[PDB]
Curated annotation (Swiss-Prot):
<feature type="site" description="Binds Target strand DNA">
    <location>
        <position position="662"/>
    </location>
</feature>
<comment type="similarity">
    <text>Belongs to the CRISPR-associated endonuclease Cas12a family.</text>
</comment>
<dbReference type="InterPro" id="IPR040787">
    <property type="entry name" value="Cas12a_REC1"/>
</dbReference>
<feature type="region of interest" description="Binds DNA protospacer adjacent motif (PAM) on target DNA">
    <location>
        <begin position="656"/>
        <end position="662"/>
    </location>
</feature>
<feature type="region of interest" description="Binds DNA in crRNA-target DNA heteroduplex">
    <location>
        <begin position="301"/>
        <end position="305"/>
    </location>
</feature>
<feature type="active site" description="For DNase activity of RuvC domain">
    <location>
        <position position="991"/>
    </location>
</feature>
<dbReference type="GO" id="GO:0003677">
    <property type="term" value="F:DNA binding"/>
</dbReference>
<feature type="region of interest" description="Bridge helix">
    <location>
        <begin position="939"/>
        <end position="956"/>
    </location>
</feature>
<keyword id="KW-0106">Calcium</keyword>
<dbReference type="Pfam" id="PF18510">
    <property type="entry name" value="NUC"/>
</dbReference>
<feature type="active site" description="For pre-crRNA processing">
    <location>
        <position position="828"/>
    </location>
</feature>
<keyword id="KW-0460">Magnesium</keyword>
<feature type="site" description="Binds Target strand DNA; via amide nitrogen">
    <location>
        <position position="811"/>
    </location>
</feature>
<dbReference type="InterPro" id="IPR053993">
    <property type="entry name" value="Cas12a_PI"/>
</dbReference>
<feature type="region of interest" description="Binds crRNA">
    <location>
        <begin position="576"/>
        <end position="580"/>
    </location>
</feature>
<feature type="site" description="Binds DNA in crRNA-target DNA heteroduplex">
    <location>
        <position position="320"/>
    </location>
</feature>
<dbReference type="Pfam" id="PF21918">
    <property type="entry name" value="cas_Cpf1_2nd"/>
</dbReference>
Amino acid sequence: MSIYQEFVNKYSLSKTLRFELIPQGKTLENIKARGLILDDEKRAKDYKKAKQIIDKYHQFFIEEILSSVCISEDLLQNYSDVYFKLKKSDDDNLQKDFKSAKDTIKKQISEYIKDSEKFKNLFNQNLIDAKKGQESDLILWLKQSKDNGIELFKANSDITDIDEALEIIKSFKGWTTYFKGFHENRKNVYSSNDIPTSIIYRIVDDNLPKFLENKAKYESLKDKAPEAINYEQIKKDLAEELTFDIDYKTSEVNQRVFSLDEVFEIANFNNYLNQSGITKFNTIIGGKFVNGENTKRKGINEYINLYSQQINDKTLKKYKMSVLFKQILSDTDKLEDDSDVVTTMQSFYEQIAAFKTVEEKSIKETLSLLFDDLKAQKLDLSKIYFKNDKSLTDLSQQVFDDYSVIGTAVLEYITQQIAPKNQELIAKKTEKAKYLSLETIKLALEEFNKHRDIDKQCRFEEILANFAAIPMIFDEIAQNKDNLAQISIKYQNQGKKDLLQASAEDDVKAIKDLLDQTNNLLHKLKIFHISQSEDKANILDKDEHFYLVFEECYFELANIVPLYNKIRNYITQKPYSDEKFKLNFENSTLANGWDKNKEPDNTAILFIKDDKYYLGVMNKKNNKIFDDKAIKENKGEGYKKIVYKLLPGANKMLPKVFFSAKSIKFYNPSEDILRIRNHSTHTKNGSPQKGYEKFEFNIEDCRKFIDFYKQSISKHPEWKDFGFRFSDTQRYNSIDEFYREVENQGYKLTFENISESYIDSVVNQGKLYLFQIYNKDFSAYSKGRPNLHTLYWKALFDERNLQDVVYKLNGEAELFYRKQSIPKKITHPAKEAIANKNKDNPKKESVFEYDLIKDKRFTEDKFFFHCPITINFKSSGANKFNDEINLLLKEKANDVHILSIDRGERHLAYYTLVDGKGNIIKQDTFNIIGNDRMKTNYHDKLAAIEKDRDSARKDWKKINNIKEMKEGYLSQVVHEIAKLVIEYNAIVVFQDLNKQVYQKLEKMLIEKLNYLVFKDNEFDKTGGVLRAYQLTAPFETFKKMGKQTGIIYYVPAGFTSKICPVTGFVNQLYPKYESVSKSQEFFSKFDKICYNLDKGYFEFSFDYKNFGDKAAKGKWTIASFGSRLINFRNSNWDTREVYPTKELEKLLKDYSIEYGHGECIKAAICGESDKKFFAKLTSVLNTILQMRNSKTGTELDYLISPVADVNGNFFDSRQAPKNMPQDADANGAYHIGLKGLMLLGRIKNNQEGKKLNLVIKNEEYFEFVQNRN
RNA sequence: AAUUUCUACUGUUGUAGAUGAGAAGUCA
DNA sequence: TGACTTCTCTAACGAGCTCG
DNA sequence: CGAGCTCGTTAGAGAAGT
């Protein structure tokens, strides 16, 4: 229905804060007097260091509930029992009831969890916090380590020792709740909530199965020699770790020897099966790497793996030697510096100057022995398994001349070696399996010559020989130490202050691969990287050839994969950085309480000077500048003091302040009602107090017991002033039905008067801290539209915004301000030559008066004071917004349009606003998109941004900016989809998208289509700056998008980039003619072919029955009318010419083909059984209809109609009409929405099917375009 | 060649489209 | 390789607690 | 030494899409 105004105001969630505040008035000169803001955004060694330094009372006791932790041994048997009730009974009885039993086990350990002595007053306000006798518990436990010597002091970071503990006692001392922010999310994430994101997934979630891994699953391991793992063999001299203290079922009191079952009992978890030692199974199950004497006591490694390898039992692979996993919630840079950002990565290989590998050899023995082993067929057919993904499959391109030819052995080597009836198992078994089996690998690599000539074979160990040549990069890499050593040579100071600019290009090219040459060796070694077997049993041979000798470097080469930013994200970074302390107005109330009674203590009250906001928090000691007795006398007209009182939610604070005991007689409550709150009698999920008896939501008792609360609300002692005129008592059904005015009035606002010297001589003496917070986009000379963070942040705290409900203030400020880095300089002063770098700026010069003074904002200490002005803040959510959108916008289909903002190669996008009959509306490409006062050009402006080698067009700039430009370049396409989407009521489905920056803002233009607030509409119209039409749903975690996610829909996300715009000819039936008789069978599969008596060339004829091409059958006759553009290498010849009509006689004369004879010469073509005579009949078909050519290469996007029309129209993108696509890039989405432009059947026929048919079938999207007749 | 920020900047002491802030774990 | 986390956006009320 | 005292806790809704 044109529902950009129909779906108005769905449900609202907050923005963030737009002010950057300059010390307006003399307040900037005032705080420089008392020195407050110098150590406010500069307390930043305390409030963000003790909150990490509070592990030693917040993880040591967060661990120490294990040392007194104890589950029942019956449950310890029931862990093997009821867990085995699920683990051996795959069913919800012992599984889900056992999950209820695990939930009971979550109550099992959990009852002892909330009852610690010091662990019941640590996550509260006396923990480090102050009581009269309540000292720092971490102050105690650290002070107990103060004489004691806990090594967390002087251990992790930023704490030299407990001598810093005065600041560990001060950084929460002044910041009372302001060393105390961290005690909210980090003291409930360990709650009883049944997520593994808690202790319940790492304390026992890795401990319930962990003891079952050694007992219920490790029980069958003792079939050979449990004493073969020598208990006396391990008890010779290195049994210091075996002095176990308590037994689980035993409970012995001595540091004595725990046996492999003596510790390993299923209820024997006195030193195992818990969270505090969850990997320490490997403390036995590995052994003892005795580095104090330089030894390695092979225990569970030397026995369970060593004798387990010494036996070599493949059926005995039910139990090996291993270690447990890691617990949860444990207590266990730059590439832009000029002295440290490279030389600190220079030790990553620089340690190996006399280094060694983990194969018990030196650095020369590491590559020559650990990397020189499995290349000779050292991996078995059933013993070695290379990583079977495309991350190793690209080595097929690197070493076999085709990653798509090397992967053919999934039909041949292990596949056709196994399945001669080629089965959907290849999508998951080995092809979709994460390991490439050496039976298909060693033998199928040798078996590569099955189809082609004899040169088309390979060596199955030959890729290991291809892996074998890896070593020689490091010899010149030692010589490559001067690569960064040119620009790094001035490394006297640690803080060298020159990183990436072109004045020091000796390091910039030289560090670009000087150790970064090994970065593709990981991308080449990707068939040796481990794969986390989540849902993968992975029964294969343990190919530990890269795991024992190569295992010193397979994990030892980890400095590359985690280093994708570390040494190469400070060149691609920025030159003047934007990080500084967030400072607080003299309390945890530092901007906290911004509401109509907090003014004494909430610390922050506004000010609007009759032109715009500039508002100050009162001074530190004399905190009664706006004190209400002195507020009465000093009334006047120079400042602003707003009167804005608020209220929290209508169940969390309504019967929590108007039912409290000090006013319980002061309100005089009722006992016939008081039975309801004594049990949660109104509570649909309620309860009484501690000692109340839980009952249901007795709404009859509720509707009056809540209705009596409105009568108690009638006695508003302080909250009477709101006039929260609620509805009838029969109406408000739930507690939220009575909570349906808890925020339906409870935020009321007004403004006051204040003397010009009242604020002034108050401020001149120092009453306020005078912050005058005002920016570019709302200054005096500003004349355009106002910005985003300045077009509400003084346009909702304003006279229209208090009339209806638009968006209040919220809490959450900070007075953030901090240092500056770039020492300033005039970049090009006004009255100079400022040449205009934009494209169509005809004024080719520029001389200002007031300069374009380069890099203004990052020059010196600004402010920052941002307050989460929670817009849309008088409405609740939209459950099934898509069910709203598909409900509502699936109710006005006739006015419905469909923009289909697809993707492209050489254009930017192609906003092909497709229409109801299927014609394009405005296929408006997007390469250079700007305004009426300029076009800001990108489509070659980015192409101008790139096109520079060194290092091969991959350096930090075109990496950074040539990506960051698209990071700019998305924005206007928002507004283009913004303007266009309700420009005709169209659903703009940038279709199914799951790239790295064309999906990486494919929901960065989908979290800005949730309400249009656009800088020039009618400022109360449904569509303008206050009362929006709600477009999307929210956006959290990128894979969640899925199908019908608001506006960013899903269309057929493949097989729509070489489409056929007239019929969609099946351009997959295209042979190679390697099998000549196979191509002769393809010639036999050639249905019927005659020379161009009307077609003007040769031809080819074959339907879907002729191939295995089961879409349909028909003599469509893709013909020989069009021309041909020819690809090539640069050098060969990247552009080439071709003729579709040509090659018709050129084959008929190469053979004896009567090309003018006019008969089934495909039989002669199949009779033409030459090696080239057959093979050349395919390459002419190889360009038989593939009409999308480079219009020169590229230079154009010449499409060609591979099959003609009913009037013979083979429509061609070189000269296409308006109602067809455009080119190679800008016409590349024009079918990709055209596939999604038929999905409105499921929109316009949406039924009670709760999951709509948003899954796409390419035969349907084939059949839909083919069904255009 | 200037912005709370960021990219594009002349649209000249700012124009233009845009921006959720901070928390705070992590798997890549 | 960037997501996947997930919650912080509140003022009155009884505390403690030095006052009055 | 009741003045109430300034801060720290304290209070508990139903929400909702392979």
